[PDB]
Amino acid sequence: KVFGRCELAAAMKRHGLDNYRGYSLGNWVCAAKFESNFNTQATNRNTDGSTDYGILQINSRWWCNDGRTPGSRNLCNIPCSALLSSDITASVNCAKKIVSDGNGMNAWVAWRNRCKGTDVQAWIRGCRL
Known about the structure:
five-coordinate Pt complexes; three-stranded antiparallel beta sheet; protein metal coordination; 6% strand; lyase; globular; Lysozyme; mainly alpha
């Protein structure tokens, strides 16, 4: 599913991401924009052999099992394929574990490089939330 900007902001807010560990909703929408262009089906291969899955490009190196990432963890206890669903529950629940792991949203290189220190509030501007 390709979400609309405000549609994803509303779904993320409903699943409890607005100011989760102090990260305002605009941070999460901004991250999804530059990770996936709001596409739940986005996948991309990493140099190390791992793969990024879904709206927030969660990595098989630590967070999910894709059956093909040797010497990796499955800390979200999910098949990576669950991160590709039109229902963002597994992506949100896994992102809450990732952002709590000590590095906050810096775990998303795209967040650090494209969202951090920017006017992220712009990403929820005009949305009925």
